[PDB]
Amino acid sequence: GPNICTTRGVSSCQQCLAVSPMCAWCSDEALPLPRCDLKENLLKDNCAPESIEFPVSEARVLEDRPLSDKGSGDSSQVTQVSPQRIALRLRPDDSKNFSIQVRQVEDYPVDIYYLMDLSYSMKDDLWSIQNLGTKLATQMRKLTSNLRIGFGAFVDKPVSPYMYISPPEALENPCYDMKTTCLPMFGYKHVLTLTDQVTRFNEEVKKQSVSRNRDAPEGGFDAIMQATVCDEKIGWRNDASHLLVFTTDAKTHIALDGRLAGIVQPNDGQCHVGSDNHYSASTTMDYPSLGLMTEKLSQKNINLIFAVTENVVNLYQNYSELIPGTTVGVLSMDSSNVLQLIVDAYGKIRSKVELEVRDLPEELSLSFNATCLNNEVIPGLKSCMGLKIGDTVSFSIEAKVRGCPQEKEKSFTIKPVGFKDSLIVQVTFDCDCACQAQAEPNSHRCNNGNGTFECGVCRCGPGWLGSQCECSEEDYQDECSPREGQPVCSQRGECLCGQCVCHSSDFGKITGKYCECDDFSCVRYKGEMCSGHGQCSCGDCLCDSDWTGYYCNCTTRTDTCMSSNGLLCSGRGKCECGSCVCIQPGSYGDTCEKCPTCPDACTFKKECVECKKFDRGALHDENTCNRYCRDEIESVKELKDTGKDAVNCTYKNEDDCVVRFQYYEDSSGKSILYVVEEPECPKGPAQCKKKLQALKKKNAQLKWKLQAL
């Protein structure tokens, strides 16, 4: 039928291609009366096949390496992501779908650099980790056969007011007044480089000592930044798990806190540690901004862990939520449980895979459909939760470009947070026809050089309203209307030399073959056209990056639909246009987190027990039991009073047996299910005449007494 390519793209080739990805242009020969039309339609018009300017959006895989089963092999390159390279070609306002797979391989080498607060309050903590290295090393044999470790230390910017300036014996020994003694003060110092030898570690722990400092908040961020950005001194290995552990019993200083000390220079994210193994810019440069820390951690692919005492757990909980790829754990005052915190934290990190994007053009946007287990598909989502080792995950991506940018080539990276391997997408844009380079300025083909000839058409200059730049106010007709029973150029113009001349309103630009398009016809959401998130073309709102819908008032975002628990709409709703659409009855709220009248917790977790422990139930049938029930669950001899918070639950299983268990919410922030191991089940194994008759009498009466209704 009368497609738009005919009406909106008749002006020229470049314009034609911009009208729509489905539009084609005939750049050769001459057939008066649509140079811009569908590919097939142009074939019916006998346009030379090789003269058809019809680009095609495509995404070729430049490098496709197979994933690895194990990462301990030194005989081959480790691949955690596939494919690695993709060449992406795109048309103006077009889109293409491609995919990417990620896997956490087994026996993957690890880098662990220890960083401890050496404030006097942490004096004891140092003595407790003297044997930590090896004690943990043995515990890490099971997780991997390849591991390197090192050590670093920090106190705070060695300057007033944080440091004792007087007396002179204070700066040398801040514990001069204190019992015994203590080291001077320093921002940060490197001790041991990441090495495969665990022995040299414990030797350095003894070698290092403790220092005191006024004002409890410390300068850990300086140490974090430097340890991250400094690759050589720390010795981070490629194709290895980068783990940075941060231990402190007190608060932390933040950016702009330096102005009190007279520091006005922002952190540059550059390594200033020298051969002296100390932070040089400690005193000169201000604390790093969280955005900067996030950036560098992301770049260097470092997983940051917060080992913090109960009192500050909450403070670092909120902080961690601002920096992806980071966990929070409770470090005991004696720093004894640190070893456990390590193994557990590692599990949390490898239980989740998150994707990040680098160097993405402003004109380019992306969409996602996350596939975690089996047929599970989660639109808009770019990460997955609750995973294990050797587990593979997939993501269906769709790239949509707004317009056709100037630059020829761009390269943006899509990678898992913390992982070295990645997918580099090389994107190009076809904004022009090949015949444009063959254009002929003021060629004799158009009214003796009064017009330019390109792509098999004469684009005439001002003054000539006819093709070939012939007629100017002469006697001619053609078709200025779609049909003889319709007006002329929509009364936005008239027929001159057999063509429509669009007017120009103060509102916008009237364009199109029959002057049917403009910039102001588009719909308006609330006070703005296309919600301001789109630009109007012939009454059509073209949504900008990360915007969709007819009115472009629907975002592609998802994070606003995430709940505190880390679930989409609390699993009781689906995210639509950024806001959760609650499904579960009696549930509502931003993330559908509020559900007063929905069944009690016991009713929800009875399915989890029935699946995890009994390998059955409606939950088990859908194979969602593993991701749903994240609660640690164990079989107990008897149900005990763990807390006023704990709730004793009871239910009858499919075997008609009474099952008892309880749910605990708290105790440092982890949920556990305790199920009684022995559910109660069914037990396997004259005068009587007067008794039967006695009941028979009653039955006769009772039956006869059935009446009324």
Binding site: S160, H503, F520, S545, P585, L692, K698
Partner: protein, 964 residues
């Protein structure tokens, strides 16, 4: 937008001295010589044995640009004893904060140290130096006999300072009291009159100060920034101070009374570490005379379109409502790491539009990360979101970033031009810049053409110079100008008019003036401010019919006007600028009538009609479609356009291009003056006998609390002389009340099993364990519908007892919502103590005989519900205990029951009085099944069979009895 970036004045200082870290104007008043004040904290001074003592320079603005350091203290470090320095002025950062009012000037050294005057120590108490006219004294309130961290030893007073209209000083210091921070205020009079050089720790009769708080407030940094403004009745300026690390480093801003230093209001940041309260400022932007608050959060991170977090910084604008309830909005930065919101500078009324303006800086923004400052104009609604101007840094980073805009001060007319100016500074490059405001000229233009429609055969006026008569007409253009400040009253303008502008070179121009014989008129017109507009008119005509064949295209009359900026100068040559939003040009259009035949006079005869949808609009934003039929009965109509006046409740969502039958029309939204309009093109011209039918959509949300209907006024308009408009149709749409109110219920637990584990009967029950398990029935009344109801009632039927048996024993009942309830029976008569759980997690994700309150003794709880709006509810949590012995006694042994609790509601009133309120009611029940377990299967067989039948038959009869 009126600031002159053409040729601003630039001032410099010693490299590495941080020249331009702090800035302010110096106005001794009495209409006297002007100066700029620049602080250089790292400037090496002449003070003996003192390095980078810091200094504040007085830059001469007039003519030569030369900064002459003002020396407050020439001496070195005083001595506590022989070879025992009392103080340490090296690197004391003097000039880190500078403020000036009238002939008074105050500069501080936040890094000035102290010996404590007791033991040998170095404590940064900070000091300041006040200079008023002929007198110069040192002011250091934190320097006292209260020392160390716990005291003001580490105060660092003077970190931020400011004056009040009452000539009182507001000085803050973060370090006081383990870095809780502190605000100290003193009367300038006392500061100087109580000053004794021989006394290091001075006491002031009248001083306001914040006291030490709990240790939990340590490291809060109160006094990081300061600003002044009155937020209560009295004319006294009240204290405002940023507290960036307050609330687990979430950031806060404390406001204290200017009189008794009593806390008035508080603010808190949304994001941690964003440093909410880094900088604070106060000005009345909406001209309500109520000081409006501004808080900077340079490290704030908004979420990009992708949903990714990005540090753009943020500034919260809080308008002070007379009532006291601040209406606040947020403003995100425009670039990453630019740290937008580092400096907020009041500009006063910059464009003299009647609304104070303001400037916000992103010192590290802009390409090359030099620096950028955004300017924002205020108005009735408030501060205009988008900035009207942008300033760029002209210097790069040697090592330290230029930090252009890090410190700035505006709101002062130095050149006496009538407009305030702005001082911006970059300590990174040791430079400072002054921006003079240009005079703003508002202008009104007009263009008239009559008669618009033209009969080619008219031939009225005669073409001069010949015997030819041509069809002519009149053209009338007007220019009115006005402005404020210093400028020549007479303003010349270069005005150019072109006829048939649409036809450019290469194409014939169809119209030209009667005399010049050309479509070009060049006029030098000079007009004065006020209503002395001139407005000249000329006569133009149309060429003969036989000179062209195109009578269709409309002849566009174009006018352009531009003033001579050179002759509009004021003092040193400062060129003015037109109002930010003014049409650079305006144009009208004429037309040629034809085919009118005999009468040669076209009568449009336009009609318009709107079909009533019949669909009532319910009170959220409801979709509404309107059918429209516009027909042209008579001859052609030029510039035909459908004009519609919509009320305040209506927002135009767009035109309907979905339906084929409905002709797709182009329409736009236009708001002129206080009028609210929708314009749709009906074709230019709309030919004779043309009938169109289309539709328009709207999203409507009630404005007035009570309204019968919403009226719309529609009509068609044309540029014709006769019958140029159609009748006005008033179509009202009645508003309806729709409130889908449902009531939900649940039982927690929903199923109880017997017997009760380790339970024992008590002749005299005491605890919950003595009675039985906890059974909670929970009902929720929620209003989903768009409309809201003001009042409602809710009734509850509880299974109180059965044959004098307790059944469910209500211990207590809680409520969350407007609802208030009463029980007809005393709750928890036995006075059993409450133990088990209001908080947290709902985010986790014998046959059967029902005992209804109808068949069992009933306890009733009636409740009065308040107002419930869209998506709002009221909840009733009924906590009870299952009375075990009841189910262990009498007929209860092997039987299973379902305890039924019914609850119904009814809406009694609505907030909409002028509308036909419709009552609504529904009901719901909550069942708790009590069941026995482990008794399904293993003379005596037949015996047991009839025993179960018997028992069951007993209950069914007992039911029918009590049911009647």
């Amino acid at each position: 937008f009126n600031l002159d970036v053409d040729s601003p004045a630039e001032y410099s200082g010693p490299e590495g001295s941080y020249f331009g870290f702090a800035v302010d104007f110096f106005v001794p008043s009495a209409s006297s010589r002007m100066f700029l004040l620049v602080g250089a904290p790292k400037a090496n001074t002449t003070q003996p044995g003192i390095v980078e003592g810091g200094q504040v320079l007085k830059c001469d603005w007039s003519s030569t640009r030369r900064c002459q350091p003002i020396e407050f203290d020439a001496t070195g470090n005083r001595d506590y004893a022989k070879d025992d320095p009392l103080e340490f002025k090296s690197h004391q950062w003097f000039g880190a904060s500078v403020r000036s009012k009238q002939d008074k000037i105050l500069a501080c050294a936040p890094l000035y140290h102290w010996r404590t005057e007791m033991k040998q120590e170095r404590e940064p108490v900070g000091t300041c130096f006040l200079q008023d006219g002929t007198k110069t004294v040192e002011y250091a309130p934190c320097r006292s006999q209260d020392i160390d961290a716990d005291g003001q030893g580490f105060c660092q007073g003077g970190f931020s300072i400011d004056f009040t209209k009452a000539d009182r000083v507001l000085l803050g210091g973060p370090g006081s009291f383990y870095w809780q921070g502190q605000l100290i205020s003193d009367q300038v009079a006392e500061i100087v009159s109580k000053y004794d050089p021989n006394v290091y720790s001075i006491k002031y009769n009248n001083q306001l100060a914040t006291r030490t708080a709990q240790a939990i407030f340590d490291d809060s940094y109160l006094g990081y920034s300061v600003a002044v403004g009155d937020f209560n009745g009295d004319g006294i300026d009240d204290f405002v101070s940023g507290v960036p690390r307050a609330a687990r480093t979430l950031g806060m801003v404390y406001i204290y009374d200017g009189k008794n230093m009593s806390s008035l209001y508080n603010f808190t940041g949304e994001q941690m570490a964003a440093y909410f309260g880094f900088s604070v400022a106060a000005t009345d932007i909406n001209g309500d005379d109520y000081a409006d608050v501004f808080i900077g959060a340079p490290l704030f991170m908004d979420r990009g379109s992708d949903g990714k977090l990005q540090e753009v910084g943020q500034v919260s604008v809080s308008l002070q409502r007379a009532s006291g309830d601040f209406q606040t909005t947020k403003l995100n930065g425009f670039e990453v790491f630019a740290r937008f919101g580092s400096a907020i500078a009041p500009l006063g009324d910059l464009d003299q539009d009647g609304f104070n303006d303001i400037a916000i800086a992103a010192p590290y923004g802009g390409e090359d990360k030099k620096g950028i400052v955004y300017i924002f104009n205020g108005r009735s609604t408030g501060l205009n979101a988008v900035p009207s101007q942008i300033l760029e840094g002209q210097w790069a980073a040697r090592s330290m970033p230029p930090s252009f805009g890090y410190s700035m001060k505006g709101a002062t007319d130095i050149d006496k031009n009538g407009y305030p100016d702005l001082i911006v500074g970059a300590f990174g490059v040791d430079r400072a810049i002054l921006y003079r405001a240009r005079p703003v000229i508002t202008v009104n233009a007009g263009l008239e053409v009559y008669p618009s429609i033209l009969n080619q055969d008219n031939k009225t006026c005669s073409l001069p110079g010949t015997a030819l008569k041509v069809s002519c007409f009149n053209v009338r253009f007007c220019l009115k100008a006005d402005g404020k400040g210093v400028l020549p009253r007479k303003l010349n303008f270069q005005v150019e008019l072109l006829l048939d502008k649409l036809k450019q070179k290469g194409a014939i121009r169809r119209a030209l003036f009667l005399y010049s014989r050309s479509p070009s008129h060049s006029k030098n017109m000079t007009i004065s401010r006020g209503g002395l507009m001139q407005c000249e008119e000329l006569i133009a005509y149309l060429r003969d019919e036989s000179e062209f064949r195109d009578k269709l295209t409309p002849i566009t009359i174009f006018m352009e006007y531009r003033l001579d900026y050179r002759t509009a100068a004021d003092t040193t040559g400062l060129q003015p600028i037109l109002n930010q939003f003014t049409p650079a040009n305006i144009s009208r259009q004429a037309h040629i009538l034809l085919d009118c035949g005999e009468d040669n006079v076209c009568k449009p005869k336009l009609e318009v009609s709107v079909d009533s949808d019949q669909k009532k609009i319910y009170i959220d934003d409801n979709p509404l479609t309107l059918i429209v039929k516009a027909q042209n009965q008579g001859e052609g109509a030029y510039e035909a356009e459908l004009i519609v006046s919509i009320p305040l409740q209506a927002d135009f969502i767009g035109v309907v291009r979905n339906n084929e039958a409905l002709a797709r029309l182009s329409c736009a939204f236009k708001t002129e003056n206080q009028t609210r309009q929708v314009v749709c093109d009906l074709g230019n011209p709309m030919k004779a006998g043309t009938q169109l039918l289309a539709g328009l959509r709207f999203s409507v949300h009630q404005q007035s609390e009570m309204d019968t209907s919403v009226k719309f006024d529609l009509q068609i308009q044309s540029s014709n002389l006769f019958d140029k408009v159609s009748p006005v149709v008033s179509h009202k749409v009645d508003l309806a009340v729709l409130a889908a109110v449902e009531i939900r219920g649940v039982s927690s637990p929903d199923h109880v099993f017997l017997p009760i584990p380790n339970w024992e009967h008590k002749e005299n029950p005491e605890t919950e364990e003595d009675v039985g398990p906890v059974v909670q029935h929970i009902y929720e009344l929620r209003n989903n519908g768009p409309s809201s109801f003001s009042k409602a009632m809710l009734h509850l039927q509880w299974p109180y007892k059965y044959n004098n048996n307790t059944l469910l024993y209500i211990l207590h009942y809680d409520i969350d919502g407007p609802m208030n309830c009463t029980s007809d029976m005393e709750i928890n008569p036995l006075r059993i103590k409450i133990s088990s759980l209001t908080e947290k997690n709902d985010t986790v994700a014998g046959d059967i005989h029902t005992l209804g309150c109808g068949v069992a003794q009933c306890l009733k709880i009636v409740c009065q519900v308040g107002r419930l709006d869209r998506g709002k509810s009221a909840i009733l949590y009924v906590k009870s205990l299952l009375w075990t012995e009841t189910f262990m006694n009498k007929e209860n042994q092997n039987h299973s029951y379902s305890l039924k609790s019914s609850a119904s509601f009814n809406v009694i009133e609505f907030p909409y009085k002028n509308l036909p309120i419709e009552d609504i009611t529904n009901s719901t029940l909550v069942t708790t099944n009590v069941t026995w377990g482990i008794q399904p299967a293993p003379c005596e067989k037949e015996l047991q069979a009839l025993e179960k039948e018997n028992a069951q038959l007993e209950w069914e009869l007992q039911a029918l009895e009590k049911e009647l």
